[PDB]
Design a protein around this ligand. Sequence first.
Ligand SMILES: Cc1cc2nc3c(=O)[nH]c(=O)nc-3n(C[C@H](O)[C@H](O)[C@H](O)COP(=O)(O)OP(=O)(O)OC[C@H]3O[C@@H](n4cnc5c(N)ncnc54)[C@H](O)[C@@H]3O)c2cc1C
Ligand SMILES: Cc1cc2nc3c(=O)[nH]c(=O)nc-3n(C[C@H](O)[C@H](O)[C@H](O)COP(=O)(O)OP(=O)(O)OC[C@H]3O[C@@H](n4cnc5c(N)ncnc54)[C@H](O)[C@@H]3O)c2cc1C
Ligand SMILES: Cc1cc2nc3c(=O)[nH]c(=O)nc-3n(C[C@H](O)[C@H](O)[C@H](O)COP(=O)(O)OP(=O)(O)OC[C@H]3O[C@@H](n4cnc5c(N)ncnc54)[C@H](O)[C@@H]3O)c2cc1C
Ligand SMILES: Cc1cc2nc3c(=O)[nH]c(=O)nc-3n(C[C@H](O)[C@H](O)[C@H](O)COP(=O)(O)OP(=O)(O)OC[C@H]3O[C@@H](n4cnc5c(N)ncnc54)[C@H](O)[C@@H]3O)c2cc1C
Lengths: 321, 320
Amino acid sequence: KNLDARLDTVYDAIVLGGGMGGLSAAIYLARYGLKCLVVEKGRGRSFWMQDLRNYVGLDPDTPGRDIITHSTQQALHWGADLLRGYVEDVTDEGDTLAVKVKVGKKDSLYPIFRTKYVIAATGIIDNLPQLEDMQNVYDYAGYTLHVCMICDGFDMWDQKAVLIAGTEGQINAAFVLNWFTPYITVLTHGLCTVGDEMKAKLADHGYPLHEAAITKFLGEDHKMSGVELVDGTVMEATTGLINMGSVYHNHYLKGIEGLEWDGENLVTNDMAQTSHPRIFALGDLKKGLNQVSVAVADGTLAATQIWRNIRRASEPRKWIH
Amino acid sequence: NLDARLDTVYDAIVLGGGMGGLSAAIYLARYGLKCLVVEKGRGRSFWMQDLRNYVGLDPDTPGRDIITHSTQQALHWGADLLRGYVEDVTDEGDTLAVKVKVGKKDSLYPIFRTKYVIAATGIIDNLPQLEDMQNVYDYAGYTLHVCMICDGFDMWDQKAVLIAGTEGQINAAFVLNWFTPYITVLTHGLCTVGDEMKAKLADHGYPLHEAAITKFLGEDHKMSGVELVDGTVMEATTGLINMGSVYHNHYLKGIEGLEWDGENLVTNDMAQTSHPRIFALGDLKKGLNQVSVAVADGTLAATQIWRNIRRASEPRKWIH
Ligand SMILES: Cc1cc2nc3c(=O)[nH]c(=O)nc-3n(C[C@H](O)[C@H](O)[C@H](O)COP(=O)(O)OP(=O)(O)OC[C@H]3O[C@@H](n4cnc5c(N)ncnc54)[C@H](O)[C@@H]3O)c2cc1C
Ligand SMILES: Cc1cc2nc3c(=O)[nH]c(=O)nc-3n(C[C@H](O)[C@H](O)[C@H](O)COP(=O)(O)OP(=O)(O)OC[C@H]3O[C@@H](n4cnc5c(N)ncnc54)[C@H](O)[C@@H]3O)c2cc1C
Ligand SMILES: Cc1cc2nc3c(=O)[nH]c(=O)nc-3n(C[C@H](O)[C@H](O)[C@H](O)COP(=O)(O)OP(=O)(O)OC[C@H]3O[C@@H](n4cnc5c(N)ncnc54)[C@H](O)[C@@H]3O)c2cc1C
Ligand SMILES: Cc1cc2nc3c(=O)[nH]c(=O)nc-3n(C[C@H](O)[C@H](O)[C@H](O)COP(=O)(O)OP(=O)(O)OC[C@H]3O[C@@H](n4cnc5c(N)ncnc54)[C@H](O)[C@@H]3O)c2cc1C
């Protein structure tokens, strides 16, 4: 009497992360008539995007937080459910997955939800240079101090720029950024000592190098004008690129057997499916390019594959008349 | 300035100024590349009255408004736009040559040279042919849909017609029924349905009518029913046209080394065809046909082209 069992609250899909890719997935899933839950912790990467520069249909000064509010409202309108919480763990239970969510930043509860499918859409977050007063960084990060080169390189064209990079591998970006502007000063923020070979290459390109810790970003109305270092060095710059790496929001999947990883990223096929038949991965979490358009299309593909699977397993709806 | 753009070798020419092509043009211009968008007008997305499911946009946004908006953005970043009809693309080694018909009458045929071509010309759905095609246009894209994944939700549990000309196309009834069981199949006089399929439709309760459609009934773009030439009248508030598509790909048929899957182009994960200088986006490439997918394809193709050109270029050094 296996099929005799009372049906448990089992979602068709749970979308982990309510950002660009996750909300796209949620819109599609709900419009496929599927029961889906979006879990969103708040204050993610796209929330700090002040100007989405390059997305068909949207003005290039649209902030990410406005897209999130718009798309969350659309997802709910079509029938998706939203839970504000922090995903802690995903466990494989065979025909379903179990998702533990931390609800409440303090005095937290840990409800567990069951689902046929999981869409991992939790993305990443860029590391920022750490100053005693982080608000001085936040006043410029995402405005004129950029974290993405393909997003904002055009808006840096031929300006005096700082590249903030903590490793020689991260300093390598100077030799890509120079496409947009040759006027690059490299700042390591006291994080690593640059070797002789790289110092010589930077010098041959004319990119000044300063290794002392940054103490203050100068500017007004979110438009940087320069940078001060703890050793007294002061420089002029109207823009910059932070290339200090990222934190990947993937901890809740590290226990899943049968998942193929590429470093911290998940490897997917052409429908955004991982090697696990019940797990999809979108956007910044999957191996590939990190853009809004890419994440949104991933959500489309994942939701469509899930609908195809569920539809194909269902009984036909007949017309009685 | 036709002669101004003739003697310049473009970094990329975008064929088709729809969803995928304008995405590519926006990225190409913002990569500081010189690109040309060639657009004939009145494409598939132009007939989309409501983009239902695209992050950031109200679900009643018409495609023509997105096209106007994104064409303006592409031009703002530095893309060039030519209103014309791509006739041919020729492989000349390190560059490609693109011939464009300019002017519907008394036409000129400028030929442009470029390092890369982005094929973004999409498809167009076949429509049921009536003596008065305006009767179809009054409902097509409003309540008579051409895409199931786009509009299925908006058909939920409504009385619907499936217009299908082959048994393979009638198969869609057994997918559409997910959204609504109240399906009537209309073959529009195009095919005689075999016995096994007729029995399956009858067993599901989906009525079948094989007579040619003569009129769509309704008001204010809202269907209310359909009339057939044999006098049959039926009630329906929505429908799905499943009659196939014409692919806008003829200008690529002379290129050796392109991998085709039927009429679609096979691409890798950066939307590149098997030809290293040709990318294919959206409805033309093998894959899912949605705005989001086409827009992302444009992102990927433009990024690969920038990577190729930049990596081939000399460093920009700072002379103090
Ligand atoms: C360009 C840019 C600009 C930025 N600007 C700002 C800014 O202006 N102001 C600012 O504060 N930050 C900003 N940030 C982010 C900043 O760098 C830190 O990552 C951020 O402040 C960390 O916040 P947090 O530790 O509270 O959240 P997290 O690090 O996500 O939270 C830590 C822990 O809190 C718990 N938790 C979090 N959310 C929830 C929830 N919803 N429910 C239950 N438990 C939860 C979990 O146990 C989690 O492990 C910016 C980042 C970038 C890339
Ligand atoms: C300053 C800035 C400017 C940018 N500009 C552009 C641009 O102009 N064009 C462009 O294409 N891209 C831009 N981007 C990049 C863009 O934001 C990302 O590429 C995009 O958001 C990727 O989408 P996602 O859905 O993968 O991630 P996100 O959109 O970041 O969404 C992931 C979501 O998961 C949530 N989350 C994470 N961990 C957990 C957890 N444990 N539980 C619950 N929820 C969780 C986060 O809070 C977040 O909301 C910019 C980014 C920044 C920082
Ligand atoms: C009625 C309707 C409703 C829809 N609703 C939705 C929806 O709600 N959500 C969704 O995701 N999708 C929807 N779609 C599908 C969506 O429009 C396509 O998937 C998308 O537009 C694909 O973009 P594309 O760039 O590949 O093609 P298109 O956007 O069609 O662009 C191709 C362009 O190429 C041009 N062109 C063609 N041939 C030539 C030539 N020889 N020379 C020059 N130019 C040429 C065309 O005029 C056109 O402007 C809908 C489609 C229709 C018909
Ligand atoms: C849902 C839906 C709704 C529709 N609604 C309508 C509608 O309301 N009204 C309507 O007319 N159609 C509508 N259509 C399209 C219609 O079905 C036909 O495909 C369309 O009318 C054909 O136009 P055309 O004869 O210009 O063909 P096209 O292929 O556009 O043009 C034919 C020839 O014209 C020349 N040419 C075209 N453009 C140019 C240019 N810019 N420069 C130089 N030469 C050029 C080329 O040599 C080309 O081979 C709709 C389609 C769909 C799917």
